[PDB]
Design a protein around this ligand. Structure first.
Ligand SMILES: *[C@@H]1O[C@H](CO)[C@@H](O[C@@H]2O[C@H](CO)[C@@H](O[C@@H]3O[C@H](CO[C@H]4O[C@H](CO)[C@@H](O)[C@H](O[C@H]5O[C@H](CO)[C@@H](O)[C@H](O)[C@@H]5O)[C@@H]4O)[C@@H](O)[C@H](O[C@H]4O[C@H](CO)[C@@H](O)[C@H](O)[C@@H]4O[C@H]4O[C@H](CO)[C@@H](O)[C@H](O)[C@@H]4O)[C@@H]3O)[C@H](O)[C@H]2NC(C)=O)[C@H](O)[C@H]1NC(C)=O
Ligand SMILES: *[C@@H]1O[C@H](CO)[C@@H](O[C@@H]2O[C@H](CO)[C@@H](O[C@@H]3O[C@H](CO[C@H]4O[C@H](CO)[C@@H](O)[C@H](O[C@H]5O[C@H](CO)[C@@H](O)[C@H](O)[C@@H]5O)[C@@H]4O)[C@@H](O)[C@H](O[C@H]4O[C@H](CO)[C@@H](O)[C@H](O)[C@@H]4O[C@H]4O[C@H](CO)[C@@H](O)[C@H](O)[C@@H]4O)[C@@H]3O)[C@H](O)[C@H]2NC(C)=O)[C@H](O)[C@H]1NC(C)=O
Lengths: 357, 357
């Protein structure tokens, strides 16, 4: 099914949730790739120490083969990550920027009840040069308490990274611009009798005089206004990520002015298309994965079925000789006592290598 | 001098510039540290290839000493970076979040001219149960054109990373909360004659009838209102980063509700205090820096004045034998032709190592 997450965006709060959840998704994709690289670099440091601790030439060349293989695929993956990383980060930054904007607009659009100030009565005056009575209010304000977005269980299940793989996303839904740009209000004026500049009894936040001024235009002459509500209604809009052919991003920049939704759709599309390729996890490498790896053809040719002779006929032998030592083999010396992999990621990593070399 | 940058914050636009410039500063500090690490890791890969290409045992141990030294200081610096990295990123994210908020509020607070709708005349009606005439407006709006922040040459010179070292920052300046929460407006009602529900001539966006209704309350009876301006005035506030003793961060969380300025000051303070330590740049290492390095005592003891015997009596000899080969020594083979440092950061890095090993 397509657009489960975007199709759940029907309010400012759910667009905020979508934008933040997608940004976190992109950020997490990068973090996961970088964690995989760092695990690979830690494995290379571990095999480097094991190579220095070996007495057998062919076992030393075996560790060197893993070092060479590890450096090749990990350096290459790190270089290849950089393009997609920057593309995904551009989208995450914009999505967080949008979510901030919308949250700030939400707080202002919640200010829907006005506080009237005490008015001043007058005669004719700008912008009512033809009036006999005016009632002028300065500094009417509207403020809301602190707003917060509340999400239901299903909000968080549907607007979720689990629904944000590129293969299911075709559109984004956004709140219309007027929610972020426009103040809206209702107001009403009321008059009774002959209000003039003399209508200077202000106890009811209007202009009254004559008779007995009081609540509900008690006086003989009265003029006033009230702002009875404020707040602009949110609307939603859909923006497609791809062109009609489905391959290319819609809303490419440089073709004329664009709306916020179009700039966001373009960034999200490019971030979705910039798939990250994660290399083999060296620390959990199996025998079959190693000898099947294309890079091991030239590496094995350089250092050495020849691969099975060096790394084992079974995966059990390979795990025994080349994988399990990382976590279980203890290294001890003094010039320090730790397991291989932790040691080669510790402050004594380099010193352990120099000691055994 | 202290607080050159914060002391230049006097407007929403200059606070936005400060917040974005400080966030970029923190981000750039991390990028610079990570670039230094990656340069060090590239140097270790280069020395690894040179060690495999050496025939002399003592020259091989010399490269191994640089490899061990490089791994030790760079792994340690990478681990030590993580705390400060996260602290600085927390502040940069919040500063960008604040700048977004303020920019969105700026756009709304620029909507200072109202568009009146056509009113509807009435008699007594809520909230003027005592009036004889009412004039009710629904959907008055205010919208501004797209706002942008314009900075002068000196704005950018003073609000600048060059003025954002921790030693000169004691406070932040922020726009007051009401700019982000409160709608403000002026309004005036005008009356003439005896306006009632019959005052249904709306051509002037007010309620008129009798005589000749027209501009400036031309008719005998008239009632109307205008929203003559909107917009909340920005104010500024100062928040100290440190306690009175000057060492500890003010506005630590967990002690009660906090304002936005206090949360930001705390994050900025911790980001300022979380100084990053960058290790020696291996690719530009000098002889004196190497033998002076404390880590080289145990490393040299493990592998070998003994340091000068291995690395050279002068820096010229050291640069010749251990630094300049990274950029000038060409490596060629086929199983590829490139200089040492570029090769060991290329797709053929691992294969070059395996070939010569
Ligand atoms: C979160 O909310 C905030 C707050 O609202 C949003 O921030 C706003 O973001 C917009 C969009 O980025 C900003 O508008 C941009 O402003 C740029 C600067 O304009 C000023 O300086 C330039 C000189 O550098 C002047 O030329 C401008 O004057 C002209 O424009 C004004 C306004 O229309 C007129 O009144 C003048 O008479 C001049 O005509 C300003 O003084 C500006 O460069 C930028 O322009 C591009 O985009 C607009 C449409 O937005 C096009 O009309 C324009 O032609 C430009 O587009 C061409 O170029 C781009 C590449 O740059 C191509 O990709 C296009 O396809 C096209 O070929 C734009 O106007 C705004 O300033 C900013 N507001 C604040 C307060 O910060 C955030 O966007 C929002 N974020 C998210 C993620 O939601
Ligand atoms: C950019 O602009 C946006 C838009 O304005 C800003 O976003 C706002 O940011 C604030 C601050 O982070 C958000 O407020 C926070 O809301 C949290 C969620 O509250 C709701 O859920 C909880 C349950 O999880 C309920 O308990 C709440 O109900 C209670 O509060 C409301 C409102 O007062 C009352 O009406 C109710 O009756 C309840 O009493 C809400 O329903 C909330 O957890 C969080 O609370 C801490 O901070 C407030 C002060 O802001 C304290 O009063 C409170 O006691 C909490 O503080 C203790 O805990 C913290 C650790 O969490 C300690 O550090 C403190 O020292 C203290 O011991 C806060 O209220 C707001 O929701 C959000 N708005 C939107 C629309 O997103 C951005 O901040 C801004 N960004 C920048 C960088 O400028």
């Amino acid at each position: 099914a397509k657009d489960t997450a975007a199709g759940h965006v029907t309010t400012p709060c759910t667009e905020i949730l979508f934008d933040l959840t997608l940004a976190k998704h992109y950020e997490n994709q990068i973090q996961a790739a970088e964690s995989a690289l760092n695990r690979n670099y830690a494995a290379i440091r571990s095999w480097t120490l094991l190579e220095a601790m070996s007495s057998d030439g062919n076992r030393q060349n075996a560790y060197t083969g893993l070092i060479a293989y590890g450096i090749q695929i990990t350096v290459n993956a790190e270089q290849e990550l950089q393009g997609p990383k920057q593309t995904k980060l551009r989208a995450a930054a914009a999505l967080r920027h949008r979510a901030a904007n919308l949250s700030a607009a939400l707080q202002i659009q919640a200010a829907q009840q006005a506080t009237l100030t005490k008015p001043t009565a007058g005669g004719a005056q700008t912008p009512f040069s033809g009036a006999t009575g005016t009632c002028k209010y300065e500094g009417i304000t509207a403020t809301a308490g602190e707003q917060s977005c509340k999400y239901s269980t299903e909000d968080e299940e549907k607007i979720n990274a689990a629904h944000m793989n590129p293969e299911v996303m075709t559109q984004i839904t956004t709140i219309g611009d007027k929610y972020l740009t426009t103040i809206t209000l209702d107001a009403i004026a009321g008059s009774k009798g002959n209000p003039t500049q003399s209508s200077a009894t202000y106890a009811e936040q209007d202009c009254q005089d004559g008779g007995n001024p009081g609540p509900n235009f008690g006086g003989a002459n009265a003029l006033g206004l009230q702002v009875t509500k404020l707040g602009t209604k949110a609307t939603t809009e859909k923006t497609n990520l791809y062109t009609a052919g489905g391959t290319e991003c819609e809303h490419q920049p440089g073709n004329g002015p664009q709306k916020t939704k179009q700039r966001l759709a373009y960034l999200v599309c490019e971030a979705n298309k910039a798939a990250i390729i994660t290399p083999t996890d060296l620390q959990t490498l199996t025998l079959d994965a190693l000898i099947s790896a294309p890079e091991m053809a030239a590496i094995g040719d350089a250092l050495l079925q020849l691969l099975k002779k060096a790394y084992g006929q079974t995966n059990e032998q390979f795990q025994k000789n080349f994988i399990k030592p990382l976590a279980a083999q203890t290294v001890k010396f003094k010039i320090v006592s730790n397991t291989v992999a932790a040691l080669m990621s510790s402050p004594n990593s380099g010193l352990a290598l120099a000691y055994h070399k």
